[PDB]
Amino acid sequence: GPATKDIPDVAGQTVDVAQKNLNVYGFTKFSQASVDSPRPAGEVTGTNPPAGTTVPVDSVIELQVSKGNQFVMPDLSGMFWVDAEPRLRALGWTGMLDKGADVDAGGSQHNRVVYQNPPAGTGVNRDGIITLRFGQ
Numbered sequence: 001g002p003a004t005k006d007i008p009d010v011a012g013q014t015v016d017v018a019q020k021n022l023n024v025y026g027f028t029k030f031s032q033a034s035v036d037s038p039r040p041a042g043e044v045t046g047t048n049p050p051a052g053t054t055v056p057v058d059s060v061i062e063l064q065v066s067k068g069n070q071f072v073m074p075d076l077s078g079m080f081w082v083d084a085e086p087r088l089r090a091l092g093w094t095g096m097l098d099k100g101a102d103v104d105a106g107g108s109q110h111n112r113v114v115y116q117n118p119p120a121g122t123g124v125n126r127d128g129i130i131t132l133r134f135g136q
Contacts (some may be wrong), residue, residue, distance in 0.1 A: 006054045007061055011046035013067045018044040022061060029060040039066035040123075069121035073130070077120050078112050081134065095127035102136035111135030 005026050010018030019030045037045055048062045048116050049055065076087050088097065105111055116132035 001057075003057050004054050005057045006052055007047060007049060007117050008024065009046050009051035010063070013044065014042050014059075015044040015063050016042075019063055022047075024059070028055070028057055030063055031060050032063040032065050034065040034067045036069045037066035039068065041065070041067040041070075042082070043116055068123060069125050071126070071128075073118065073122060073124045074126065075120040077116060078114070082109070093094055093128045095125075095129040098129060098131035099129055100133045103133060105135035107135075109135065 002110070005028065007028075008022060008025055010021050012018075013021070015032050019032070022028065022030060032044075034041070035045070039045060043066050045064050045066045047064065055061065074091065076084070079087065084097065103114060111134060113132050113134040116130055118130050124130060
């Protein structure tokens with residue numbers, strides 16, 4: 001039989017689906033590698049060689065899996081800066097806390113974080129960088 005087959009680009013679906021799809025046209029060997037991208041973790045942005053590349057049918061194809069670089073941030077909204085610091089280290093956060101504006105309220109009124117641009121439960125980059133506004 002033929003020992004070479006041209007690979008289609010399976011950039012657009014899930015890596016599993018892409019690997020399965022190529023396997024249907026190939027029966028080749030596949031391996032996956034995750035690279036940082038805005039694409040959510042699991043989506044494949046493609047293969048190293050472009051569509052139309054003839055490869056040996058017994059060779060291995062490398063699927064570039066895009067990792068969003070993001071993780072679901074746990075809940076910690078509505079806290080003070082003095083509560084934040086222990087929480088940040090407990091959470092092992094490496095990034096910077098970007099404080100935008102402070103809202104007039106006062107310690108007596110409880111200077112808590114009121115609004116943050118990236119909410120808890122939303123995916124935040126590996127650096128965990130969140131910009132927020134809290135009481136002054």
